Amino acid sequence: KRPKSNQDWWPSKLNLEILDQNARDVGPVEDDFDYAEEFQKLDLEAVKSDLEELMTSSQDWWPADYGHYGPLFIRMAWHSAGTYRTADGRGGAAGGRQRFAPINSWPDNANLDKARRLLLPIKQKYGQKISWADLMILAGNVAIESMGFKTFGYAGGREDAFEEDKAVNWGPEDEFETQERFDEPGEIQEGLGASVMGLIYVNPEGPDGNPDPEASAKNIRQTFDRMAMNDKETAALIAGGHTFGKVHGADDPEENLGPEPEAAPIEQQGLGWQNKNGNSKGGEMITSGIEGPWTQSPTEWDMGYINNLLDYEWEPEKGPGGAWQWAPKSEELKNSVPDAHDPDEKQTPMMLTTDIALKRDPDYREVMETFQENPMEFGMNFAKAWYKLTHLDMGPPERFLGPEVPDEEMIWQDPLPDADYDLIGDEEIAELKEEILDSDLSVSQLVKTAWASASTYRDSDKRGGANGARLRLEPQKNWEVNEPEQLETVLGTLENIQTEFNDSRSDGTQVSLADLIVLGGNAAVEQAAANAGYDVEIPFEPGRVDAGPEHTDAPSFDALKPKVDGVRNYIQDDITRPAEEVLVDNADLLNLTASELTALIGGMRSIGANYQDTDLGVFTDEPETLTNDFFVNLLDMGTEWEPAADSEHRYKGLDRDTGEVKWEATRIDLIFGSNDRLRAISEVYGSADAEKKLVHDFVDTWSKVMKLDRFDLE
Amino acid sequence: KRPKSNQDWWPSKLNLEILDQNARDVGPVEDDFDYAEEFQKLDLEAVKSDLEELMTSSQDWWPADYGHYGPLFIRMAWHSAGTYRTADGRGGAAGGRQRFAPINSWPDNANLDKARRLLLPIKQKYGQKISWADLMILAGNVAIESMGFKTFGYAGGREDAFEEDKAVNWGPEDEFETQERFDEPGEIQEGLGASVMGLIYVNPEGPDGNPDPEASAKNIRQTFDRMAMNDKETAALIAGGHTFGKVHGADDPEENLGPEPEAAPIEQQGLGWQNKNGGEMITSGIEGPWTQSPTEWDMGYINNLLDYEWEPEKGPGGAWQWAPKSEELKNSVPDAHDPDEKQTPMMLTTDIALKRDPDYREVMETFQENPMEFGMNFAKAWYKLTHLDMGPPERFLGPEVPDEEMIWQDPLPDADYDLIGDEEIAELKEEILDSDLSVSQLVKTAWASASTYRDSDKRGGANGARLRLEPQKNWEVNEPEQLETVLGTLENIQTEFNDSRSDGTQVSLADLIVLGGNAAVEQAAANAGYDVEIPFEPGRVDAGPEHTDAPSFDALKPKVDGVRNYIQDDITRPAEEVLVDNADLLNLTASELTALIGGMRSIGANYQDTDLGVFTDEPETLTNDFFVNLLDMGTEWEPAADSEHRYKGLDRDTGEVKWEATRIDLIFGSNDRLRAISEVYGSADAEKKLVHDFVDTWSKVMKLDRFDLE
Ligand code: HEM
Numbered sequence A: 001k002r003p004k005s006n007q008d009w010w011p012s013k014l015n016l017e018i019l020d021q022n023a024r025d026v027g028p029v030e031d032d033f034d035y036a037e038e039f040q041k042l043d044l045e046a047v048k049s050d051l052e053e054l055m056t057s058s059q060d061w062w063p064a065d066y067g068h069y070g071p072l073f074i075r076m077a078w079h080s081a082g083t084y085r086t087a088d089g090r091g092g093a094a095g096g097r098q099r100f101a102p103i104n105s106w107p108d109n110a111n112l113d114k115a116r117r118l119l120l121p122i123k124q125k126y127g128q129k130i131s132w133a134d135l136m137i138l139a140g141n142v143a144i145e146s147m148g149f150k151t152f153g154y155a156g157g158r159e160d161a162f163e164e165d166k167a168v169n170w171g172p173e174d175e176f177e178t179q180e181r182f183d184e185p186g187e188i189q190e191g192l193g194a195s196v197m198g199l200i201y202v203n204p205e206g207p208d209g210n211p212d213p214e215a216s217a218k219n220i221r222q223t224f225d226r227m228a229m230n231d232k233e234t235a236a237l238i239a240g241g242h243t244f245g246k247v248h249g250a251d252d253p254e255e256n257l258g259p260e261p262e263a264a265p266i267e268q269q270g271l272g273w274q275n276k277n278g279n280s281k282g283g284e285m286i287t288s289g290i291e292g293p294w295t296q297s298p299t300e301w302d303m304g305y306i307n308n309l310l311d312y313e314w315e316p317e318k319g320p321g322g323a324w325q326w327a328p329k330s331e332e333l334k335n336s337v338p339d340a341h342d343p344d345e346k347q348t349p350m351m352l353t354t355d356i357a358l359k360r361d362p363d364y365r366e367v368m369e370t371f372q373e374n375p376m377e378f379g380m381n382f383a384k385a386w387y388k389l390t391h392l393d394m395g396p397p398e399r400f401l402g403p404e405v406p407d408e409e410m411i412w413q414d415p416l417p418d419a420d421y422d423l424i425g426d427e428e429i430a431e432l433k434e435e436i437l438d439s440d441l442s443v444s445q446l447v448k449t450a451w452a453s454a455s456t457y458r459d460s461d462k463r464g465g466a467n468g469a470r471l472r473l474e475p476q477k478n479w480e481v482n483e484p485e486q487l488e489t490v491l492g493t494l495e496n497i498q499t500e501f502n503d504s505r506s507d508g509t510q511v512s513l514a515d516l517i518v519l520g521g522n523a524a525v526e527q528a529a530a531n532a533g534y535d536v537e538i539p540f541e542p543g544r545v546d547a548g549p550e551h552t553d554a555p556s557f558d559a560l561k562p563k564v565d566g567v568r569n570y571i572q573d574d575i576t577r578p579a580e581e582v583l584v585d586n587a588d589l590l591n592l593t594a595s596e597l598t599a600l601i602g603g604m605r606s607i608g609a610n611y612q613d614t615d616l617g618v619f620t621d622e623p624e625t626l627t628n629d630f631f632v633n634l635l636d637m638g639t640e641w642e643p644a645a646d647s648e649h650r651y652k653g654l655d656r657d658t659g660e661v662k663w664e665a666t667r668i669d670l671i672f673g674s675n676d677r678l679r680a681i682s683e684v685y686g687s688a689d690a691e692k693k694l695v696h697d698f699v700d701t702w703s704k705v706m707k708l709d710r711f712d713l714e
Numbered sequence B: 001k002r003p004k005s006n007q008d009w010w011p012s013k014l015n016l017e018i019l020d021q022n023a024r025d026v027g028p029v030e031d032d033f034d035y036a037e038e039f040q041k042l043d044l045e046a047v048k049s050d051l052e053e054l055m056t057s058s059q060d061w062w063p064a065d066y067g068h069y070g071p072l073f074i075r076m077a078w079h080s081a082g083t084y085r086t087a088d089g090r091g092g093a094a095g096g097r098q099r100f101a102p103i104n105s106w107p108d109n110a111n112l113d114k115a116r117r118l119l120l121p122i123k124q125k126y127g128q129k130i131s132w133a134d135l136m137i138l139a140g141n142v143a144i145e146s147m148g149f150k151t152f153g154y155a156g157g158r159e160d161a162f163e164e165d166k167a168v169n170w171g172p173e174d175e176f177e178t179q180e181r182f183d184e185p186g187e188i189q190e191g192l193g194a195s196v197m198g199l200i201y202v203n204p205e206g207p208d209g210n211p212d213p214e215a216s217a218k219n220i221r222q223t224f225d226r227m228a229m230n231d232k233e234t235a236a237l238i239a240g241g242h243t244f245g246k247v248h249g250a251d252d253p254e255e256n257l258g259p260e261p262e263a264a265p266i267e268q269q270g271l272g273w274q275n276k277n278g279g280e281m282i283t284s285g286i287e288g289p290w291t292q293s294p295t296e297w298d299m300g301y302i303n304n305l306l307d308y309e310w311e312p313e314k315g316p317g318g319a320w321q322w323a324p325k326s327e328e329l330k331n332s333v334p335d336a337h338d339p340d341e342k343q344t345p346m347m348l349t350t351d352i353a354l355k356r357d358p359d360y361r362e363v364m365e366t367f368q369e370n371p372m373e374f375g376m377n378f379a380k381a382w383y384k385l386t387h388l389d390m391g392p393p394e395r396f397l398g399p400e401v402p403d404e405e406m407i408w409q410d411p412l413p414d415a416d417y418d419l420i421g422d423e424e425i426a427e428l429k430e431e432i433l434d435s436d437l438s439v440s441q442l443v444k445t446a447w448a449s450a451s452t453y454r455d456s457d458k459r460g461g462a463n464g465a466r467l468r469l470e471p472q473k474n475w476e477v478n479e480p481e482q483l484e485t486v487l488g489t490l491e492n493i494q495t496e497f498n499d500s501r502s503d504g505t506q507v508s509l510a511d512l513i514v515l516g517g518n519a520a521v522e523q524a525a526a527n528a529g530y531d532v533e534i535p536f537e538p539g540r541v542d543a544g545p546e547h548t549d550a551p552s553f554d555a556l557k558p559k560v561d562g563v564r565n566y567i568q569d570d571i572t573r574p575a576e577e578v579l580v581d582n583a584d585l586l587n588l589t590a591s592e593l594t595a596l597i598g599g600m601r602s603i604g605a606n607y608q609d610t611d612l613g614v615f616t617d618e619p620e621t622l623t624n625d626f627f628v629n630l631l632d633m634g635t636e637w638e639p640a641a642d643s644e645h646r647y648k649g650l651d652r653d654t655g656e657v658k659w660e661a662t663r664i665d666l667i668f669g670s671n672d673r674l675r676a677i678s679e680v681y682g683s684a685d686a687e688k689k690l691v692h693d694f695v696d697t698w699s700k701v702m703k704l705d706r707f708d709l710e
């Protein structure tokens, strides 16, 4: 049978498994070497040369359309990066997770198992020097280039994952190719990048399977927006992409294709969708169930897509695979395209409902008209959009490796300016820490501010962090959670210190506000530990710079705004999920393990760095003194808990005997004494000789978070 | 909502998560610090003194019955150790996993959340010096001692787990307290230690809820047998345990108790079964004490059971229970809380089972004839029950460990001789390689010796050379005929060496087996062009039949052996699932398992010397050939005709039949995660890494039962 899962018995059980993924690096790789180093040893041009040859080296087990695999590889790359969501930065091509379930078996990724299989020889040849992640995007680039279109650039550095990302919530649906996320097109439930479970963006036949182009445009626009693309970028990508290849639907996929990869027999060795007539038959190939090319020359860059779409009238019909597609009302395009495999046959172009959407929608139409009138403009926008699409989850320019990285840095890379001054030394670091502690700022204020600065980092797409001090810029400076009013006060004091420090130097040395914010936080934690009798020294890495509005796409940073913040015990009154679930989801972005999260929160409550300075979870009589009081008091059976009257997130801790109110807290605090696993960690920290251990573990986790975006140490 | 799992989309997806548990050590504890060292610092007597006081220190949130928590702690300890299964060694008290789901929420563990909570202050007071696992058993011991019965002994050493054991298959049922595992009592499906999902062993009311004691006895006998206990031990444990306390069922549990811990509100802070309404406690739904003095060791249970006639009835909680016919026992027991109230003794269907079943009755009559005999059968059975998953005697720690070692500990003799040195080792290795034994014979034999180890209960392993004794020497998988040949040759080497020595130095056959294996692996590596030096730990001893309970070792027999590509024809689960299950027992991660099998196939050490999975034309040469050829798209795979787990690999262009393989070999090229690992080892410049990873894993397995080093 099956060893069953606690998840099955209790559907609402905290999914700590997502944090366990941060406790180790699954896979055979040794944790002594970084991929960046290995990639640097790669002869990129040699790999591209091999990719070039592969493009026209048809393998019989999966015949190349028109004798060129290029279009297939472009789709592969498109789908690899296409799962990206701006909401949490998850999905995307950075880990090459298209290779693992569930993505590897999504209907929208049908036959991409074969595409990836074609690249295996090249992958084996270069080994660790090139990740599957980097290889898949490079294959897409070489494809495009070999078909007459120079790409804007390419960067390597994507480290391969060895399993799926367990933290990604792909939707509520209990079945692929079905949707329970939108009633009206354009109103998809927030936090999802697609309109249908198992699809990249939208249904190619139209919303809910109805060939309604106008409605389709609403979903296309919303989904692409959730994938960081605007109208011009979306139109450029779709049009540029569909300028190549064709759709496959020789027959109905629901009855002519075998089980997806995950459900396929062991002998298929990782492949899926076995065609009843044999995969070898190019003329019987089935993928989406839709059939036909978009242009007359499917393997050459040109204006064929835009011209076919705009210059002709189209009608909705049922294709050979039984799916909705569009045919031209004219007879000028009849059999105007050669058959993908039969040298003695021809085909007629077709358009997807989603293609017609670009022509029917007013705004998209304006863009397409402009593109048709200005080929160079079309090319320019597609080149930049393709580069963006394939690199948006790689983080800052510091992480872009290789000889093909453009000199130009794009705004979506959240670029950082150079430090035109000498860095502070050890003596200055000690000096500044003392000066910060000697100001009117409290330990709580300093800890709260440093956390506000670093807490925006997310390991999914490497965006956020303390470097740049974007906390002082829009929109962060005005985020409710950051307490704008209070924030300005703290930053003013730190700015004055910066001013006085810089003016007193005579050697060219300067300190950034970004560093002082973190340095003040470290000093505060050290002081808190000192008040408890412990002497700890937090390692500090100077060099963070102060980014300006010119380096910041303000609107794009709103996605990093936390709805729940554990360190500050902040809970937005709009959250749907239980507070603890959001807490775990956010902890994952900071690469925290269950134990680290526990030490962080429990240690923090001893210091007391709450939003609006509440006493929620602050189970101690000596605030700003780092101890294990949180755990000792949380575990005291002398206290009985209950939801607070007329409160949405408040709970009261009452003396079991007297009935007196001893403490107040939220689910963020109480989850550590409720969840079976977290309670086990709490018991360790709440024991008699575990205070020093908690202090050190807290300090280690604090330091870890403060340095998350310092890729220079990576 | 919440993120769905691949498990939900694909129910039959390989559960590699069980192997991932061997990769990292969740929990806040350092990876270096070892528990044995910390327990050594503990003042055991001080802990017992505190537990002694706790027994009569009633806490308002869970008032002690009869003013003594002893019985409750006994039940807590019995349930902690009670989930053990000999089949895989899983379950049991060694990790204190009663603290985590699903066990912490099984209906049979109702209100033990409170029992464990009572121990929290002591746990906090002593910290890392005593694990929850050790403390729960110690609490049971102190309870028994405080109520007038001396225990046989106690050993510390149980390292706390920080999560549930994902490798345990608790059963096929989709609902607690239901059973889809037996059609006739005494015929429960293989591999399960209980007759019902969510219960420790059996239904207290009777099989399928029918109060039939003769039938109940059949399930009691089979389940306890699956937990390593025979008739005398079973009767002694039940009678001894029920000499204490009572069952709680003031009203029906189905409508009077709140949700189990895992489903309880956050404010309950880990507790569950909150009563929705002198002791109105409700646990099992059955109500009443077994004896007149529930907090005193005596013959009350046995006398009440055997000296009176009993009849079944529905108690106040709506459950089956038995009442005595005589009015002599009516109101003979004080109420657990209401001092001005009395109660009549009761028996469970499972207790009446000990009287109605012919064989159990004979045992009980014997117990009643001599309390001293009953007492010691119970003392020894309680010790066994609570220590059977702790491994050999070397792992038993503390001042209360008995000088006497029991056969279930799989004891080992002392080495009454001087250990061999580096020169002797080098010499012996050469001697082995100079014999007519092949690289394959040596690797296979060393694997056969070491592969029986299981991390679940720490049984098995190469120490003791039990491979040469019954029943292992005759297991089909070990190829008896071939094994004898190897052992004979190695035995002659041992004899010659031991005689040649003059300073009293000797070498065990146990060590020669492993040394031979290592030498062979080092040779296989050398054939491929690699110089590897496998570390060797001399000191394994040769156990004899007197240190071996032969029938108990059959539980360690493999149904599937990946290294030897052996698959029993009676397996129910897919071979790859058994492979993963067995890999977990060897503490292997997915990558280690992958390196082990792949590397092993280049060496070629298959059962019956088949070419299954041996994707290389250079056998006994350690390379990454397995992966290179497995991943070659030039080859197409198909199921072998009329085969069970066999496949054929054909060249796609030439039609040449290149290879033969099993699901064991092919899963590494099919499963999404394993294939990613395979691609790494099958890469152009990864052969050296594969060789090293294989060697490291081989060495790891050979040393699994070397606790002396732990
Ligand atoms: C509104 C978004 C889109 C939808 C609904 C969509 C749709 C689809 C469908 C249904 C197929 C055919 C699969 C098959 O049967 O073989 C296909 C393929 C293709 N798509 Fe798109 N697509 C979109 C966007 C994009 C983008 C942004 C790119 C790349 C810049 C790309 C490029 C391709 C290429 C090159 C092919 C042809 C593959 C081949 O010849 O095998 N697509 N698409």
Ligand code: HEM
Residues within 6 Å of the ligand: B065, B071, B072, B074, B075, B078, B200, B201, B202, B203, B204, B220, B237, B238, B240, B241, B242, B244, B245, B246, B247, B248, B249, B282, B283, B284, B285, B286, B350, B382
């Ligand atoms: C498979 C055979 C057995 C069955 C069916 C069984 C059943 C039960 C049930 C139904 C309860 C009452 C739970 C409650 O309502 O509070 C109980 C309690 C008890 N059991 Fe057993 N049991 C068995 C074996 C054992 C063994 C082997 C021992 C220990 C040597 C033990 C010791 C206890 C103790 C001392 C209590 C009383 C708890 C208290 O007073 O709170 N039991 N059992």
